[PDB]
Nucleic acid binder design. Structure first.
Lengths: 283, 285, 288, 288
DNA sequence: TATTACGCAAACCGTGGTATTGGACGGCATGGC
DNA sequence: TGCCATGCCGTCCAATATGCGTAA
């Protein structure tokens, strides 16, 4: 079986004659009878004569998917349809990353996403291999073939129990915070949030008081919700109305958002994300 | 062209063009030239596969309809009933669904059957698009236009190594299992069996000690046969007499799992209607 | 078998080389090497290989970290006994109760018992029963536990369940919805990989109510699920602790039913209990 | 904080008088009292009150005496745990399988290895021959099991045993070929094969001199057996598949010169872990 | 009106030792209660 | 008279350096 025999058969069916369709497609009569006579051999039955209803219901359905299939394969390359395998790590989940995907899904409504938790490292392997598309965290070291895109900057906020709201007012700076018993995060991750918080202190001269380092951002505020600790978080987390906790920005003391992706052989839906995240960067 | 699709599907299988030609007894220049012609006729980079995997999917669909148009037309001319395309997910494939298929093929002798493995969700996509007439599994969520009919219900059986066989006996309750290392299944087929087993445990106030979930039933029973872990199967598998594995009927009130099938109620082809009449005719049996 | 042979080995396995480790330890390379060849003698197994660790190296790593962090706990365990303080209650947790539940119990406990402190450690519903029976953890919190022969399971309270949809979907369910109201909501659950946990009970509670539910996705934790919900790509189900927090662009709707509660629970080894856990267990039972 | 003070302070407490401790320790007394100064200086707390009649443990004395024995078990017991890891006595053998050996062959090999290494475990995941090698090289999988493995750099094939082939046909059709049969008897039978495998089966007819009549083709073994016991197909299966008493299926031993499929065992050549290093010790030895 | 009988053009395949100096830690002797 | 601390010194450890149109 081949394609010409199916369009012929449909044309011969709609025209009711092996010559009325021969003009409906602009070719002489011998080939009309040359291919349907050969069509009834690629099948075995006698469709028409000087089972035909059974093979017609299929032939119009074989070409229908053929045209529709071409419109999928092309639109797939245009990145209009496709699942984005997003990987993440840490603080930008609470507010940052969700707004970036929902804004990207407004940009490309047919696309879907799949979240896969991964450390800043397992992203690099996951990107250099092709398991994931983008990896979200804050502090990424360079890697010979991975490009970073710094999107924006977040403020850092002190978290404290509501009982001690007035003890630090609305907002206070970094030096006001030498005796605060900061309990940071995360335990996992070789140089992540806490390590850079410690860094912004030494660059500011104050050696920080740190009592414990817990697993999550939500584990440091868990201790704060019980008054058993005080922590410091990005503006993403402080945007959430956390019960029993009070927040205060810290006043050259920002941390960034950065997605990482492989620079070679980029899938289309990934490049449509890169398009939306770069236009969303400078704005 | 039809010669083009084949080549492409043989090339996505192969990964390189040289091996694919070996599978077609052709050379590399022919398939390369035709893939160039096809990439140009479609308008998408298909190269080492590219973002035109959707074309691979639709081309598999097209060749499926080509074959199932040939065979369909033949059997329709013969006055036969045709070829009932049945999908299956999970454990029914082991014993239950084969008996149902035999009971249908003997009653409708002019009819044949074809099996392709799909998930509970892949089965609804197949029932819609016209890929399959009926799908078979255990726990189906309702879906508009699709109808579910459970043929019968099966008992559950603990499956433990023949050494740890005399410990449980001929039958055992769920409460006997509060400290048993259960290796369940199937891993990754959406909510299916293992989730129902956990639900049956959680329904009796027992949060179960579960150590593993492996590929399908055969992997769990292979870790059982290997004296590594015990599992829970339904009676379809337990009635296959697996070597070195002993089964004890898990007795209880809500300890049973159904065999259900799904089909489209909109446009029911005649073979599907005959098979549904048989299935309902075997609802009480 | 010597403490400096432990501090050297740990910094080696962490930095990944016998030079940045000596840099991280303020020593030279010869003594770092000389103490490892002495370490490989008292134990008898090759730990390091030209740097990665042998399987002997990793199994010995978790032993050496248990030793050092034990001495660090004792360093403060003694100074608090001098002042007669109640001390450190090492508590573990797994799952949804960390968002509101467990913070409030520790809040009230640290009010009634003032001289005590707490350490939070994220373990698994069976990684706890290991720590309990070994003493590394006093009480571990989570939802659904299996009975273990040495551990006493105790329930604390019930929490409700809330369907989590985007703020736009809020009118579809209003304030209250039942389980059957969700028969066709593509749900994104959690936690992924923490043995049988939350998602497996939600699958049960539907299955218990005769609803084989639609499950779309399972992600790492609750935070990752509500993220896909506040982005519109998901609709989730969270307990009361997660919903008691006001989350942006997310509308929570209570699930109404006669068997739709999930519990708060802690576990403790009932054999040789330290006195601070006793002052703690006498406070959690009073919560009922 | 060093180990010598831990053995002393316990002996000082167990003796009740530091003088008696030095004898049980086979040392002179001035070390005892001198070590306890540095011990209480590194800790920064008072453990012992001294009189002319002996000592008595302070509040820190008891509180640290428990921490002391706990540190000293692990120090001694960490050596025995590390020797087991290096010895391969402990470890999870992460096996990956593909196809028909899972029905009987691989279970018995895992059983024979576990019988010979009882303090070990097995994680059984399912992978394609390409996922195995793409995983063995990376390291996510210890050993891969399947029928026919392609020679690849970095790995090592081990053809351990051979399995005869068996005609699978329905119980009704069972008297048509006998308890055994040669390859040529199967000229007319319509064979529903499955992969890989089905490529090698046709090879076995073609290598004995037959162009077989292939009817259908699935890609699951239980899918071929399903059609067979349903009265819709016949197939050719390994002995592991025929070893299972299949409910309505009958099996007939295919006999002939070199008509058998092998059981192959694939693993990475370099840098093999202990639990694998013993497992291959059990693979090659059991080849007899 | 549908097959047939032709020919020509077109399609398409063959780190680990070595040496020294500083400290640790024990063992005898004395002082303090 | 035990029992605990304090010096002094010697030895050991450790760490830096073919497929159509045309014709029949």
């Amino acid at each position: 079986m081949e394609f010409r025999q199916l369009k012929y058969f449909i044309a011969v069916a709609e025209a009711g004659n092996m010559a009325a369709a021969a003009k409906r497609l602009h070719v002489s009569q011998p080939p009309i009878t040359r291919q349907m006579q050969a069509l009834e051999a690629d099948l075995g039955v006698v469709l028409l004569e000087r089972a035909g209803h059974a093979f017609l219901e299929d032939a119009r359905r074989i070409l229908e998917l053929a045209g529709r299939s071409g419109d999928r394969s092309r639109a797939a390359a245009r990145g209009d349809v496709g699942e984005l395998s997003v990987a993440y790590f840490g603080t930008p989940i609470y507010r940052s990353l969700p707004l970036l995907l929902r804004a990207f899904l407004t940009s490309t409504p047919t696309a879907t996403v799949s979240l896969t938790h991964m450390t800043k490292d397992e992203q690099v392997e996951g990107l250099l291999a092709g398991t994931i598309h983008v990896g979200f965290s804050r502090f990424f070291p360079r890697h010979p073939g991975i490009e970073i895109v710094n999107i924006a900057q977040e403020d850092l906020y002190l978290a404290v129990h509501r009982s001690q709201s007035g003890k630090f007012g609305k907002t206070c700076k970094l030096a006001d915070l030498r005796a605060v018993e900061l309990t940071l995060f995360p335990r996992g991750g070789r140089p992540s949030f806490a390590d850079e918080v410690i860094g912004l202190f030494k660059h500011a001269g104050i050696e920080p008081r740190i009592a414990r380092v817990v697993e999550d951002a939500t584990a440091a505020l868990a201790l704060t919700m019980a008054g058993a600790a005080s922590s410091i978080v990005p503006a993403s987390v402080a945007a959430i109305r956390w019960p029993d906790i009070a927040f205060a920005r810290i006043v050259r003391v920002k941390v960034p958002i950065s997605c990482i992706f492989r620079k070679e052989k980029q899938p289309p839906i990934l490049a449509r994300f890169v398009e939306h995240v770069r236009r969303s960067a400078k704005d």
